[PDB]
């Protein structure tokens, strides 16, 4: 189900997903100097029923001192959330790349990646993208 690796993280390029396939997990992590609330949740899970998909376990933090069938959307930011998000994607996930600010794309093809399943191992197709300043 889950992909045992992250996207290839092309240098000078970031990535994001338009929608998250059911089964995606978002770790509940907070800034420095803040901690996950006690008795809180470790991750949010994208679940769904015959007509809906939502996230399961709302995150929290405290001081340390249109829809698409079968997909969730971006969960809203929560207070004192970390600067980045950790996702645990599943096979059939599509992630699009984009050159970081200040760069430009030296190609005309699609900057897309997909988590495939073959021979018991899952890894993402190498994007055909190059970023140059």
């Amino acid at each position: 189900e889950l992909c045992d690796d992250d996207p290839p993280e092309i240098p000078h390029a970031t990535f994001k997903a338009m929608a998250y396939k059911e089964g995606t997990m978002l770790n509940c992590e907070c800034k420095r100097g803040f901690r996950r609330i006690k008795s809180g949740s470790l991750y949010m899970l994208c679940t769904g029923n015959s007509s809906h998909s939502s996230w399961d376990n709302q995150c929290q933090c405290t001081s340390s001192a249109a829809s698409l069938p079968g997909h969730c959307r971006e969960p809203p930011p929560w207070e004192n959330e970390a600067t980045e998000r950790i996702y645990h994607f599943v096979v059939g996930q599509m992630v699009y790349y984009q050159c970081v600010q200040g760069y430009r794309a030296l190609h005309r093809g699609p900057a897309e990646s997909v988590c495939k399943m073959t021979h018991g191992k899952t890894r993402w197709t190498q994007p055909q993208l190059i970023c140059t300043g």
Partner: antibody
Amino acid sequence: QVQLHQSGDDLVKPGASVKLSCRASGYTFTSYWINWVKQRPGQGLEWIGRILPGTNSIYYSEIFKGKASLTVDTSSNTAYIQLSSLSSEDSAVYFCARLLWNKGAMDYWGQGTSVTVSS
Amino acid sequence: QIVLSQSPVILSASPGEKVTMTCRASSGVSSIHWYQQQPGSSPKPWIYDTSSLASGVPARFSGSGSGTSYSLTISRVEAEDAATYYCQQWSSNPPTFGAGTKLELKR
């Protein structure tokens, strides 16, 4: 077994409006989406819109925005689609369908409702 | 919106022959569904998720593909297979169908 049954073949004049129905059976009506599809003679299928009976949620295709409207009557678990400003190109077979959510497919279809317009 | 193109438009295969059909997406999609519509009848689910042979379907059909190229294959044609097959995607809104590829028997 699930079953969807639609109205019979309807013939109407150009410029008028008509309502096509698709009564559901064999499953909970408000727990699933109902999709509408169009098939002009020898031209392939064409998705129209979505409607959830129990939540009053409606989505449309950019092509059909305003040319069709989806309504529901939860008392008799029947779905409706109303077509307005009918023209010569609107003659086709219309299917109601049920959305398999986790797969993003259609798992049950109606028998089709032919509609033709002529002078 | 994604455009799916199926070729060949009309395919003629002798019974017992192994044949393949292709649906090609303008932009990559996660999976493709397939339907079979006999004349004067509604479409019938055939292959979900490009590999999940739909329940009640003969085991002679199989599908596989990835990215922007997918294919529906028949191990051996039979009389019941005279119909048209449509590929579908819902990786983005709105969902789209192919133009259809008819199946005919040789003589």
